[PDB]
Amino acid sequence: ECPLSHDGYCLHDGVCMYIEALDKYACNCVVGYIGERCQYRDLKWWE
Amino acid sequence: ECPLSHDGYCLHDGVCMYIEALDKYACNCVVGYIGERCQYRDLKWWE
Amino acid sequence: EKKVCQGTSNKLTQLGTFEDHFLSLQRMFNNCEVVLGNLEITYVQRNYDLSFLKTIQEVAGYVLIALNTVERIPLENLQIIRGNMYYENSYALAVLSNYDANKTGLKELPMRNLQEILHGAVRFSNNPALCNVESIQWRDIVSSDFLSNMSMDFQNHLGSCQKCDPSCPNGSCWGAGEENCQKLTKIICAQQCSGRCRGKSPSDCCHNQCAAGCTGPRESDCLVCRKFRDEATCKDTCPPLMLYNPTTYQMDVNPEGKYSFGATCVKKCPRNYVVTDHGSCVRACGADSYEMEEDGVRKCKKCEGPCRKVCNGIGIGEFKDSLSINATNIKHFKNCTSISGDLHILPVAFRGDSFTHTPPLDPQELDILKTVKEITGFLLIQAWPENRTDLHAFENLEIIRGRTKQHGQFSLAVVSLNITSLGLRSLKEISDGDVIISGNKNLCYANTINWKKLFGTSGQKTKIISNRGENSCKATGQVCHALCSPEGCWGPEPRDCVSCRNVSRGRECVDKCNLLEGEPREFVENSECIQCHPECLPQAMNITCTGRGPDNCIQCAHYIDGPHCVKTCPAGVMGENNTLVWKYADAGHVCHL
Amino acid sequence: EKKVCQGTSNKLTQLGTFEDHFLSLQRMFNNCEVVLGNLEITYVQRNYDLSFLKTIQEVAGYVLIALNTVERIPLENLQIIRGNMYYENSYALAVLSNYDANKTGLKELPMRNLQEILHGAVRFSNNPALCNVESIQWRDIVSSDFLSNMSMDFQNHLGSCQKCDPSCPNGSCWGAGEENCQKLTKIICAQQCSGRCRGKSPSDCCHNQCAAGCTGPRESDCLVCRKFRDEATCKDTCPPLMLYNPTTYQMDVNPEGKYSFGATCVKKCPRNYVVTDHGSCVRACGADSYEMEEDGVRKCKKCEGPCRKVCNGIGIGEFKDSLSINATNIKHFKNCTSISGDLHILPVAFRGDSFTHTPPLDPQELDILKTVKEITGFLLIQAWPENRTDLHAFENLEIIRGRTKQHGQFSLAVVSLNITSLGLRSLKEISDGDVIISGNKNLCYANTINWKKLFGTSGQKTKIISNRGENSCKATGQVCHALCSPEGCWGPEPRDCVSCRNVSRGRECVDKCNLLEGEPREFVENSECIQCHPECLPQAMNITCTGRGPDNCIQCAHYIDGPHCVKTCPAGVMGENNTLVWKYADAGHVCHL
Numbered sequence A, B: 001e002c003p004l005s006h007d008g009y010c011l012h013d014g015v016c017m018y019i020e021a022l023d024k025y026a027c028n029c030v031v032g033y034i035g036e037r038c039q040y041r042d043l044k045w046w047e
Numbered sequence C, D: 001e002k003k004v005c006q007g008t009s010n011k012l013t014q015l016g017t018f019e020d021h022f023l024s025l026q027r028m029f030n031n032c033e034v035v036l037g038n039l040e041i042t043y044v045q046r047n048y049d050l051s052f053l054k055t056i057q058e059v060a061g062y063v064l065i066a067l068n069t070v071e072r073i074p075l076e077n078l079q080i081i082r083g084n085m086y087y088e089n090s091y092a093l094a095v096l097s098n099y100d101a102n103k104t105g106l107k108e109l110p111m112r113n114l115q116e117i118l119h120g121a122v123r124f125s126n127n128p129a130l131c132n133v134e135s136i137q138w139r140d141i142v143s144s145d146f147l148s149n150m151s152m153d154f155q156n157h158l159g160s161c162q163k164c165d166p167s168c169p170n171g172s173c174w175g176a177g178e179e180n181c182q183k184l185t186k187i188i189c190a191q192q193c194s195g196r197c198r199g200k201s202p203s204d205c206c207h208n209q210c211a212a213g214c215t216g217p218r219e220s221d222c223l224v225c226r227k228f229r230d231e232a233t234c235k236d237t238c239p240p241l242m243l244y245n246p247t248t249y250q251m252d253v254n255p256e257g258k259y260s261f262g263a264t265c266v267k268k269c270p271r272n273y274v275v276t277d278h279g280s281c282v283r284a285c286g287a288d289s290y291e292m293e294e295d296g297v298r299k300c301k302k303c304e305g306p307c308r309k310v311c312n313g314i315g316i317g318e319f320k321d322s323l324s325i326n327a328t329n330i331k332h333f334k335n336c337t338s339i340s341g342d343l344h345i346l347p348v349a350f351r352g353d354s355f356t357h358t359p360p361l362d363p364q365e366l367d368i369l370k371t372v373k374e375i376t377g378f379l380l381i382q383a384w385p386e387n388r389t390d391l392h393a394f395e396n397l398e399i400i401r402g403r404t405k406q407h408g409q410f411s412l413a414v415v416s417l418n419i420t421s422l423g424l425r426s427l428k429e430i431s432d433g434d435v436i437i438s439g440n441k442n443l444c445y446a447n448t449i450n451w452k453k454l455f456g457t458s459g460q461k462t463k464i465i466s467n468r469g470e471n472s473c474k475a476t477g478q479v480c481h482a483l484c485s486p487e488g489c490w491g492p493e494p495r496d497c498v499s500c501r502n503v504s505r506g507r508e509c510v511d512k513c514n515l516l517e518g519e520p521r522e523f524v525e526n527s528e529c530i531q532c533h534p535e536c537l538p539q540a541m542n543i544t545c546t547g548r549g550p551d552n553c554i555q556c557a558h559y560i561d562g563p564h565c566v567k568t569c570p571a572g573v574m575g576e577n578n579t580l581v582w583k584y585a586d587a588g589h590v591c592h593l
């Protein structure tokens, strides 16, 4: 979705995506990480 | 006017007096001194 | 006190699937009234329910409703949007692109109690099905500063909604019903109302610190506070400790002195914060001062010349927009012993990143962090290379204050590592937050540590669970060294004990300080081994020495000078009136004058 | 800025005759609007006029109208009575015993603008002819605290006055006419007015800091201020230098930081005051701190252990009710170098006083005041014994700040003495007030002193007049020593010069520092004589030495050690690695190794 200039932007095997209705970039984290670019560990629930 | 227990209360040759309508004591300074008991030198006017 | 929650920081980040993000949003905002972080409603698909969002009454950040094809979002009790951090550096209420592939997205947004956004503006974009919101006059809700920063966009080529009820001023309503009408607070005021009011009558002027509205003329009748709060009233400034005297030109002690903490004026600052001379609860003082020794609370005093080069942590100061300790900022952590912020260790430093084109972080380079002794923020260790098996960088870390916290609950996170042991042998005080050590592989190492002795604030817990086996690791040398005290132990080394059983030579747990044998001559005080002066003779029958000074030797080694035991007699030491003292020995080695 | 005056402090003291007191009252209160002291209307007999009292609009103390048989006292513009110092420790408006021998005293008192006394109550006693004042409801004028401290007394057995005009509420009027009616400010308010208002309508609520009344809803529409003033507005607290941040938990710099000075919030403190960290202009800091070195302004920093024993002056602190330095308080001025107040010298200390039964003050005992070096208040020297002819106690006084002033105009008064000279040889700075030296007998001594170099604040004058002859004293050795510089001289001694002509040996004005003759070996720098090291040889052909060190001798006296000139060679001085250095002399006296 998002072009090749943003490789490695979404950490912890999260996939990068491009929202074209807002002209913005977004991440998709795995279960256990939150944040803008999958950088915050989910400490409150499930380790 | 005022009794003998308040001798020297009014400085710089000021005379002591007793106000009986208020049951209080007062001084009479010479020209050149103000204050409660003639203790403040008149510095603003006439030396 | 209202129910608080920290919220999320997900701008547009979906969490796994749609159901996983929906469950995370459900678990984040259940029974929350004051959102200290950000209200972020993203990725809520059709046939869902959002009844848990009805209790939110205060958001301290930006409200971001994006990509939501659900029919109704009941934000019915949202009375104030503070907006401490903006969205797109200009907005605090952004509803963005709520439509599916069939152009049927968000339909109703009944923000019945939204009356003023303090800092921020309104950004609506690409909302075809969102009706009954464009009729709201946004002059009441936006502040007097941001009339030009606002931007509106609507699409009304649907024709599926209805109009307002004819019992409300200027035809303004949020949804279906007479209860969904906008309560006008500013534009219907008279000339004499300086801020906002209730009705068109001039006798309804509210207080200045009443942000949304007022239930009366007094400052105790405000619904929500504007800046500060004296616990039932809303205030501009907290009452300081010292009030000025216009008569005697002095500074008198105020009996009602309240310390400013956040949006509140508390009676006293907490333990891990800093009390200033102005009467405030701060995290860091000025550049010309330093936080000095605690006399019960933490103050600040001036330094000589320039102060110490204080390292700004991750997320505050010059490193505010940063996210991890990387190859650039690690040169700034050279010679500082007090971290005024966070120390985040992420896999982005060790794996590499082409978005900034930086070289990856080196494991030997982390020895620049050997001199770290104090962390005011929270510690987040998340990545570690497979070479070293011990956290050798944090070997001198003593006190973790935890003035900022991850999720407002945790302050020490050591997760997902290939380490063997922890090695935190100098950690003596954790004043805030919970400590979680989980998601690891070769680290059991926790059943002896009494965390209540390290917790400086009551009401804290831990989640050290699901590490390794819980019955199979403990038979392969997992139990630490046998000279550790049962109060706790960090690693299997004899020096990694928390305290010792009998004596502690420096850091090593020994049974005795070499009484009647051993090469060094040591004694016992404060359960520690301390060497004496080397002119004590080694006695193998009785004890050797008691104190550190040379007067405490029982028998001198070579020479004796009164009570002192000395190697050589004084033969030219500086005396009095140009007399260098000549002293000669005796048959009992007494240095005679 | 309104016209200010300091007023009088005469409680019941008549000044000479009735005409002399009337002329003093006339000269004191002409063209005054803000009375910072006390409004004291006493001893005004019949057939007089008091039209100069119409311009007074603010009294910061107690109003005392006593023994006044004049018919009318027009206090028509008195809008506020602050009352910083009470009368009988309870009142601030006392009208007391206005009647003659024929029981015809004060008749009318038209206080048309008196609406609220802030601190104080009302005491009326023994006023037979005072009509049209007892009908005034005093609930509006007294504060909400002093409802029980008030006391009223009237005599209505005259029947000479008339009633009020039937166009005013509740029949309240101060005098004859419809313009003399009381403007009710509090008792006619509604429920929503927190303080005071204008009319019976609920839409007239004024600001809290509007003391008397308001001309509108804003805080800039107050007539007079309650506590503080931002220069067109009336405020509770001045805006400080640092405002608290509820977001980042910090202390940000306020661009609108105003320093609190009295009832005003000025932009910066003046020269002789103290700037605090809270943003105030004070006279003295706390007991745990001291006023440190000026960096343009005066700050305060903490001391180690206890601070210096600061001597409280006459009229402030523990010596507030005192009036002179007497035989009791002089033991408290033992070892202090900074006087935080006044140093009054009165004839009551040297003549004796049986009201307290204290022994008189001794002239040798004034040497306890030898260590006085700084006066923050004003100096009032008024008495001196006929033995000593010089003010030898103030020989180390350096800077007179003058933070408080006699009559608000004068800070250094040396009057009515039997001294010969002044002897103020160390007085370097007078930051406030005028300097008057008059009423003396044997003291001309003033025509050379340039007072503008000592005045630290512009707009000051002096009244050194009518001392001795002005042409006859100046031919009998009145002119000071001929080596004084023409900048000024205090006494006839060679050391009492302000500055010197050529050089100054310590304090003595010399032409040169013993070049080519003289017993001490001295050089010239900063127009001063400085001795050298005694191992410089005395040369009678050329100069001797240049600098203070032993390297600056041209020829050594006895021994030479490189560049140094020394008495003895080093024969056992401490060196390095246990080597006491033996040095032997040469034929040229060079101490060789």
Ligand SMILES: *[C@@H]1O[C@H](CO)[C@@H](O[C@@H]2O[C@H](CO)[C@@H](O)[C@H](O[C@@H]3O[C@H](CO)[C@@H](O)[C@H](O[C@H]4O[C@H](CO)[C@@H](O)[C@H](O)[C@@H]4O)[C@@H]3O)[C@H]2NC(C)=O)[C@H](O)[C@H]1NC(C)=O
Residues within 6 Å of the ligand: C089, C321, C322, C323, C324, C325, C326, C327, C328, C329, C348, C352, C353, C356, C357, C358
């Ligand atoms: C490793 O740590 C590095 C520590 O410096 C880190 O570098 C930081 O990366 C951030 C990524 O978002 C930057 O925000 C941050 O500072 C930026 O520097 C730019 C220089 O021109 C500024 O222009 C920028 O200002 C604005 O830019 C962003 C762009 O999206 C705006 O959204 C934002 O509102 C902001 O105001 C900003 O100041 C940068 N730090 C420094 C000192 O440059 C690096 O990213 C880390 N990660 C790696 C290497 O993977």
Ligand SMILES: *[C@@H]1O[C@H](CO)[C@@H](O[C@@H]2O[C@H](CO)[C@@H](O)[C@H](O[C@@H]3O[C@H](CO)[C@@H](O)[C@H](O[C@H]4O[C@H](CO)[C@@H](O)[C@H](O)[C@@H]4O)[C@@H]3O)[C@H]2NC(C)=O)[C@H](O)[C@H]1NC(C)=O
Residues within 6 Å of the ligand: D089, D321, D322, D323, D324, D325, D326, D327, D328, D329, D348, D352, D353, D356, D357, D358
């Ligand atoms: C020489 O200097 C002396 C400095 O101590 C000075 O002594 C002071 O004289 C003042 C004259 O009025 C006193 O006010 C002052 O303190 C008083 O001490 C009294 C002891 O009992 C207190 O009772 C008194 O309290 C109240 O008394 C007066 C009485 O009229 C009230 O009017 C007033 O409101 C007050 O509240 C007050 O505290 C006194 N200082 C000390 C330490 O005693 C002395 O008068 C000077 N002059 C001489 C010797 O001629």
Ligand SMILES: *[C@@H]1O[C@H](CO)[C@@H](O)[C@H](O)[C@H]1NC(C)=O
Residues within 6 Å of the ligand: C026, C030, C031, C052
């Ligand atoms: C929120 O938590 C409460 C626990 O008190 C629970 O009863 C409720 O069902 C939760 N909300 C949702 C939407 O599940």
Ligand SMILES: *[C@@H]1O[C@H](CO)[C@@H](O)[C@H](O)[C@H]1NC(C)=O
Residues within 6 Å of the ligand: C090, C145, C146, C148, C149
């Ligand atoms: C938005 O408001 C800010 C004030 O906070 C100011 O920069 C300007 O008015 C607006 N900014 C832009 C970029 O339009």
Ligand SMILES: *[C@@H]1O[C@H](CO)[C@@H](O)[C@H](O)[C@H]1NC(C)=O
Residues within 6 Å of the ligand: D026, D030, D031, D052
């Ligand atoms: C007050 O002073 C002015 C000078 O400006 C003078 O004209 C006036 O007569 C004085 N007042 C009285 C009552 O003399």
Ligand SMILES: *[C@@H]1O[C@H](CO)[C@@H](O)[C@H](O)[C@H]1NC(C)=O
Residues within 6 Å of the ligand: D090, D145, D146, D148, D149
């Ligand atoms: C007068 O008021 C004061 C408060 O300032 C208090 O002492 C008391 O209420 C009154 N005093 C007396 C002596 O009645």
